[PDB]
Design a binder for this molecule. Structure first.
Ligand SMILES: CCCCCCCCCCCCCCCCCC(=O)OC[C@H](COP(=O)([O-])OCC(O)COP(=O)([O-])OC[C@@H](COC(=O)CCCCCCCCCCCCCCCCC)OC(=O)CCCCCCCCCCCCCCCCC)OC(=O)CCCCCCCCCCCCCCCCC
Ligand SMILES: CCCCCCCCCCCCCCCCCC(=O)OC[C@H](COP(=O)([O-])OCC(O)COP(=O)([O-])OC[C@@H](COC(=O)CCCCCCCCCCCCCCCCC)OC(=O)CCCCCCCCCCCCCCCCC)OC(=O)CCCCCCCCCCCCCCCCC
Ligand SMILES: CCCCCCCCCCCCCCCCC[C@@H](O)O[C@H](CO[C@H](O)CCCCCCCCCCCCCCC)COP(=O)(O)OCC[N+](C)(C)C
Ligand SMILES: CCCCCCCCCCCCCCCCC[C@@H](O)O[C@H](CO[C@H](O)CCCCCCCCCCCCCCC)COP(=O)(O)OCC[N+](C)(C)C
Ligand SMILES: CCCCCCCC/C=C\CCCCCCCC(=O)O[C@H](COC(=O)CCCCCCC/C=C/CCCCCCCC)COP(=O)(O)OCCN
Lengths: 126, 97, 105, 347, 83, 121, 99, 171
């Protein structure tokens, strides 16, 4: 029940940072929770998505959160049976974004450009 | 099963913590981000278990949009602080019902 | 409300990603491809009300494939009965289930 | 901001709404809501002051929480059925979560608290946009999944919205808060008929949007945000006050004006489903909205309040910018009752 | 033509990094549509067998379908070897 | 009724082809005249707000107001008539195809019906 | 489980070495005697976040090049990079990269 | 509902091919060239019936064909094959390109003994055709009867009787 143990820890870290003590410490709790969740995804078989959590989430977004704060004051049964061939299905589905998800790429890129513009306009001040 | 339940429970705990609002709007943003992380884990597990290949883009997409929202929220927080010198929630009482 | 621009123009903006059984890359099947295909073919062209009433068998099988609640319940019952029997002392596992078996390629 | 940037942001808001309206995939609907929220924040904050910033952060927090629960409902629905299409909801817990998320997006009671504060904080143009355009996407989503809504929860929230709007409007001297409470009551009227007929919902939405556009444009023309400031308009442009009085009478549901068409139709539809008590209570409660509309009409055009000396200078000047479609909005919000059977166009 | 040449000459001085960036980006945009080897890359991607080739049931009406891998019917990869 | 999911419906068609089998509304339709009256009222209100002589300020503007209202009203009337025709068509087809839900009532005569009498006293 | 053991060993050695470093010189006896909140740094952090999101979008490119739809994939990758360059240009032109 | 039918353990007895992955990889090309027919029959049956229990005989046949192939290799080309698969077994990726020399020897030997020609590039991935006497299954999905569609009313449109019939409106 390794997966279950990870899940219990995940919930404990969530309870820890959800009490909202000293937002720096809440950020540390959320960092620990994100690490445990990435471990859950990695142990499941989603290597790329777990590493995406670990890189994007932890190293960009929580890093920016901590920077802004610093400026201020049962298992194993439901699994498959066969194999995936000579590739990983998760990588194929993720790479299908450029061949199948043209609409998704268009809307996401437009949203990100609009987000840059919006951030600049909001922080302008005056 | 149990794993799914824990992930949902984490989402409910994060939502409750967001709705508590002791102080420190930064804590509200942290609760929102925890909710999104729970959603990411849950959707990834569902998509991987059922071998929905084309749905593997969906978590990434979610993450990206959520982080964009996070940036937006952070900007708002900063502006509020630049008006009051603190991110205290009780300072946002100029507008009332 | 819903303006079916895709159906009017034949665009396919997001329909490619709506179901498991719709043209996956490298022809990789979903775990419940057959159940979903059967349920969709049962319910097609009939409407939501009649589909809910008349295609309940296919949807039940699809949900069983998706979540495997009945299978896990049956396995749990068998395992619990085995544990009770071994605690009492009347059943013993064979060498196949104790790691003493002969594996095959 | 720069006019090019403002136009781009407005187009992004409309494009997010249209993406919600045209997509058949739950993820694309969520993306449309996200795009709309992202582009909406600068529009509220266009005139920079602490009140506008506070309103923007309140709106952001509310909409972000609603979008998070919407994603959770989508994921639960996918878990219990490998479906991404917007159809029957397949799960009661997921459907309750979706209904609550859309209710907070719309501002229905008990999630109504943010609407008056956000409307008071922002300017009149931002309030116009927020109270007219920002209702299309959640209502369209609710219309698409109407056959799965639990009628008890929907009717409870609708009746609560009507009561809360009626009671909260009685206490207001600020015009923007009056508009916010009126919007809450009209949202309750719109959502009380979703379980039975979505055409009635759309008709009510169209009539309400026309009336709200007319009233907001009249308030912009006579640049008033309080009752006493509006009481000075008769001494500069009495025609504006008379038009506003007729529009306010229409907004109160008085026949033979246009605002009577929705309630009438909705009542009829509800009676066709053996529902008698609820439409009766709904009309009784709309009497409160009519009362505070009448109070505004008393202070605005039916009596003459004292003026000031410096008003004389204002007599020598004319409005430089004239809003097109204002006369059309007034006529459409006052005199379309004889054309009621046109609703079969499935508006 | 003089103004554009003057602008290019003034940009090559005091701003060479941006000139190189725009040149490389434009070349990357334009060249793939003119190269003849992009079709070869598509063909190479097509000829990579990731899945098992499921045989077809013979009914005596498929002369183009080989009955053995060594049969001359079917697609060939001599062009790939010659590349 | 909810004819949104009606089979064979083009997603964004204002007037289908089968709508052309119905008589068009007359140009002297009372509803068309009311639409023109609405346009005239819009023109008068436009004159009044802009502080111009209400009756005789812009004749071209008032004419455009009336013409636009009449144009849109004509097309709206066509669509409304078509929708009501579809409703009636479906009702009659359904009644025809389900005879056991709509039985012919055995006609009775008031001379053989016993109705209670209540005196007014 | 090999990666788990490797991480455990690394963390254990780091903790042991730091603890002995912090406790070895603590056995002998000795004497034993704001506001500013720069906007520019916040802007740099936010620009990093948005550019990192666009990198997260661009990451699956090594696998995207085997699809048989090479023209569509190339078009979409160039679209993503062009919009990233446009974001940089917009931040540059509106004085968002100054100190 | 229902009982899952499973074949007896006796039905699953067959002389197993007891060689490791390196030996199989060394002889994979000749094995595909020589044993194509039973393998393609088995794979067509497997993809058509969609049931493991309906394809057991073809599996025993492919096992027998592989055994015959390996017996021929053993009786004719033992030592060059041994060197070739030792080559292949050394590598952590089992690459073909490291010691082509040994491969050549093996190829030469078989070309002298069995007249076997190694299939070229792009040949083992061809989609071939199979001539089988096994009848085509008619309901491999075990589907039930599809519910009948809706009546699909059709006819000529007539104007609505007395118009909209909404309250007091005469049109
Ligand atoms: C039915 C459902 C409808 C629901 C509600 C309708 C939405 C109404 C809001 C839309 C825009 C807001 C607006 O026009 O002001 C309110 C307006 C009153 O005008 P105003 O208060 O004097 O304008 C104040 C502006 O905020 C002053 O801002 P500005 O001076 O910066 O304006 C710049 C101007 C000029 O824009 C330009 O400079 C053009 C340059 C092109 C930019 C290229 C960008 C491409 C990338 O562009 C605009 O005004 C926005 C147009 C957006 C395009 C939409 C397509 O009232 C209405 O528009 C009522 C509309 C009636 C309903 C719509 C039509 C009937 C159906
Ligand atoms: C079943 C219903 C049947 C009838 C339908 C009724 C509605 C129809 C019309 C709807 C609206 C369209 C026209 C109104 C535009 C407003 C313009 C205006 O104010 O009038 C000025 C203007 C005269 O003034 P002016 O010297 O030009 O310039 C003065 C400035 O305009 C400004 O002058 P000022 O600033 O010096 O004076 C200020 C004054 C100015 O304030 C106003 O007068 C504003 C007007 C009220 C707002 C309009 C509401 C919008 C429509 C809703 C209608 C509700 C009907 C529902 C029933 C409820 C009844 C309330 O405001 C005040 O004194 C404040 C005190 C407020 C008193 C209480 C307010 C009650 C308002 C309710 C009125 C409802 C009926 C109005 C009838 C028409 C009124 C002109 O009036 C006119 O002469 C035009 C009226 C129509 C022209 C008819 C010509 C056609 C004849 C050709 C031949 C006959 C045709 C037959 C063909 C066959 C023959 C061969
Ligand atoms: C029709 C109305 C046109 C004008 C109105 C435009 C409305 C707003 C703009 C948004 C519309 C987007 C149009 C593109 C829709 C995507 C689908 C279409 O393009 O087909 C794709 C073809 O891809 C095209 O090459 C995409 C090119 C479009 C991107 C270039 C410009 C995009 C700008 C859009 C607006 C965003 C902001 C503006 C920036 C300047 C799919 O390729 P295909 O391989 O067959 O099918 C995939 C499935 N397979 C794998 C099974 C085969
Ligand atoms: C105050 C009264 C309301 C005024 C409304 C604004 C008036 C100006 C708008 C100009 C006309 C807009 C119509 C757009 C042109 C083509 C529309 C066509 O492509 O779409 C059709 C749809 O056409 C429109 O629905 C009809 C709009 C007509 C509105 C008139 C009804 C008003 C109620 C009666 C009051 C009298 C008003 C008369 C004076 C204007 C097909 O719809 P469909 O994609 O298949 O289904 C989606 C809608 N569902 C989900 C509800 C079924
Ligand atoms: C069409 C292809 C597009 C795709 C490729 C893009 C790749 C990445 C490049 C874009 C990144 C962002 C660029 C942002 C542009 C900002 C320009 C700017 O404002 O800079 C000016 C300075 O630069 C300028 O003058 C404006 C641009 C000058 C022209 C640049 C090149 C234009 C095109 C030249 C190449 C054309 C094609 C080459 C063909 C050659 C033959 C192969 C101000 O600089 P300061 O920091 O303020 O310092 C000034 C005080 N010391």
């Amino acid at each position: 029940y390794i997966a279950f143990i990870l899940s219990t820890i995940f919930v404990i870290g969530f309870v820890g940072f959800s009490s909202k003590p000293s937002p720096i410490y809440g950020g540390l709790g959320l960092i620990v929770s994100g690490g445990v969740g990435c471990g859950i995804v990695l142990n499941f078989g989603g290597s790329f998505l777990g590493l995406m959590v670990f890189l994007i989430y932890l190293g960009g977004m929580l890093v920016v959160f901590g920077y802004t704060t610093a400026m201020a004051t049962g298992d194993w049964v439901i699994y498959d049976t066969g194999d995936s061939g000579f590739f990983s299905e998760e990588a194929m589905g993720i790479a299908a974004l450029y061949s199948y998800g043209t609409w998704l790429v268009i809307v996401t890129g437009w949203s990100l450009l609009i987000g840059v513009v919006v951030i600049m306009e909001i922080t302008r001040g005056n | 099963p149990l794993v799914y339940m824990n992930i949902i429970m984490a989402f409910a705990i994060a939502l409750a913590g967001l709705l508590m609002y002791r102080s420190h709007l930064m804590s509200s943003l942290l609760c929102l981000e925890g909710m999104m992380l729970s959603l990411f884990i849950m959707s990834t597990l569902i998509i991987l278990n059922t071998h929905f290949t084309l749905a593997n883009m969906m978590p990434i997409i979610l993450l990206v949009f959520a982080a964009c929202e996070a940036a937006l929220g952070l900007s708002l927080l900063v502006m509020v602080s630049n008006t009051y010198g603190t991110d205290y929630v009780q300072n946002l009482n100029l507008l009332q019902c | 409300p819903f303006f079916d621009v895709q159906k009017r123009l034949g665009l396919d903006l997001d329909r490619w990603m709506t179901i498991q059984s719709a043209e996956q890359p490298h022809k990789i099947p979903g775990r419940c491809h057959a159940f979903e295909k059967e349920w969709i073919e049962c319910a097609h062209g009939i409407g939501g009300i009649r589909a809910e009433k008349e295609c309940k068998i296919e949807f039940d099988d699809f949900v069983e494939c998706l979540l495997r609640q009945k299978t896990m319940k049956r396995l749990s019952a068998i395992k619990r009965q085995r544990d009770k029997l071994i605690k009492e002392g009347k059943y013993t596992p064979p060498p196949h289930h104790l790691g003493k078996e002969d594996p095959r390629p | 901001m720069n006019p090019i940037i403002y136009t781009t942001l407005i187009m992004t808001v409309m494009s997010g709404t249209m993406l919600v309206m045209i997509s058949s995939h739950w993820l694309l609907i969520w993306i449309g809501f996200e795009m709309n929220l992202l582009a909406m924040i600068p529009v509220l904050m266009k005139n920079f002051n602490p009140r506008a910033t506070e309103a923007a952060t309140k709106y952001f927090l509310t909409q972000a929480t609603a979008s998070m629960m919407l994603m959770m409902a989508i994921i639960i629905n996918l878990l219990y059925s490998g479906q991404w299409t917007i159809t029957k909801m397949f799960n009661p817990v997921a459907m309750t979560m979706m209904t609550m998320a859309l209710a907070m997006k719309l501002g229905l009671s008990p999630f109504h608290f943010w609407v008056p504060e956000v409307t008071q904080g922002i300017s009149l143009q931002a309030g116009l946009l927020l109270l007219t355009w920002q209702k299309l996407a959640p209502l369209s989503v609710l219309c698409q999944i109407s056959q799965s809504i639990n009628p008890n929860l929907m009717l409870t929230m609708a009746m609560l919205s009507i009561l809360i709007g009626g009671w909260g409007g009685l206490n207001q001297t600020q015009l923007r808060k009056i508009m916010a409470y009126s919007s809450i009551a009209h949202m309750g009227w719109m959502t009380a008929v979703l379980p039975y007929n979505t055409t009635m919902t759309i008709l009510n939405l169209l009539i309400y949007i026309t009336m709200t556009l007319a009233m907001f444009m009249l308030l912009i023309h006579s640049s008033a945000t309080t009752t006493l400031s509006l009481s000075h308009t008769w001494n500069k442009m009495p025609v504006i006050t008379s038009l506003m009085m007729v529009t306010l009478l229409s907004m109160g549901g008085l026949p033979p004006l246009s605002g009577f068409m929705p309630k009438w139709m909705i009542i009829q539809e509800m009676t066709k489903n053996e529902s008698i008590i609820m439409p009766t209570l709904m009309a009784m409660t709309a009497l409160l909205n009519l009362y505070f509309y009448m109070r505004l009409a008393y202070s605005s055009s039916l009596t003459m309040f004292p003026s000031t000396n410096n008003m004389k200078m204002k007599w020598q000047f004319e409005h430089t910018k004239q809003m097109k479609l204002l006369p059309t909005m007034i006529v459409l919000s006052t005199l379309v009752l004889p054309m009621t059977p046109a609703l079969s166009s499935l508006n | 033509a003089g103004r554009i040449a003057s602008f290019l000459k003034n940009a090559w001085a005091k701003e060479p990094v941006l000139v190189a960036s725009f040149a490389i980006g434009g070349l990357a945009i334009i060249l793939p549509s003119l190269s003849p080897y992009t079709n070869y890359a598509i063909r190479i991607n097509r000829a990579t067998p990731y899945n098992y080739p499921v045989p077809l049931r013979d009914d005596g009406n498929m002369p183009d379908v080989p009955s053995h891998p060594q049969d001359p019917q079917g697609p060939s990869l001599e062009w790939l070897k010659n590349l | 009724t909810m004819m949104s999911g009606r089979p064979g419906r083009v997603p964004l068609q204002f007037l289908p082809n089968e709508a052309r089998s119905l008589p068009p509304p007359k140009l002297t339709d009372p509803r068309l005249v009311y639409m023109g009256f609405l346009g005239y009222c819009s023109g008068l209100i436009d004159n009044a707000i802009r502080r111009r002589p209400v009756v005789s300020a812009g004749l071209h503007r008032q004419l455009l107001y009336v013409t636009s209202f009449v144009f849109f009203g004509y097309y709206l009337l066509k669509r409304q008539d078509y929708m009501y025709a579809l409703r009636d068509h479906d009702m009659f087809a359904y009644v025809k195809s389900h005879p056991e839900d709509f039985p012919e009532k055995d006609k009775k005569t008031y001379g053989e019906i016993l109705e209670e009498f209540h005196p007014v006293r | 489980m090999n990666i788990m053991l490797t991480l455990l060993t690394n963390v254990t050695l780091a903790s042991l070495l730091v603890l002995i470093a912090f406790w070895l010189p603590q056995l002998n006896a000795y004497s034993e005697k704001r506001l500013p909140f720069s906007m520019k740094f916040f802007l740099v952090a936010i620009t990093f976040l948005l550019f990192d999101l666009e990198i997260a979008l661009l990451l699956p490119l090594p696998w995207a090049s085997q699809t048989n739809n090479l023209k569509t994939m190339l078009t979409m990758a160039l679209f993503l990079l062009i919009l990233l360059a446009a974001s940089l240009a917009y931040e540059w032109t509106q004085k968002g990269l100054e100190w | 509902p229902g009982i899952v039918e499973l074949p007896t353990l006796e039905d699953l007895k067959v002389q197993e091919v007891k060689v490791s992955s390196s030996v199989l990889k060394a002889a994979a090309h000749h094995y595909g060239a020589q044993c194509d027919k039973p393998n393609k029959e088995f794979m067509l049956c497997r993809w058509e019936e969609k049931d493991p229990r309906r394809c057991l005989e073809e599996g025993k046949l492919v096992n027998q064909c592989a055994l015959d192939f390996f017996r021929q290799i053993k009786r004719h080309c033992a030592e060059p094959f041994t060197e070739y698969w030792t080559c292949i077994d050394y590598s952590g990726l089992q690459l073909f390109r490291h010691c082509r020399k040994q491969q050549a020897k093996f190829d030469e030997c078989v070309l002298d003994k069995l007249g076997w020609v190694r299939p070229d590039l792009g040949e083992l991935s061809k989609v071939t055709k199979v001539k089988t006497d096994r009848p085509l299954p008619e309901n491999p999905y075990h589907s039930r009867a599809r519910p009948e569609p809706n009546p699909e009313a059709e006819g000529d449109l007539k104007p609505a009787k007395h118009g909209s019939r909404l309250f007091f409106w005469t049109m």
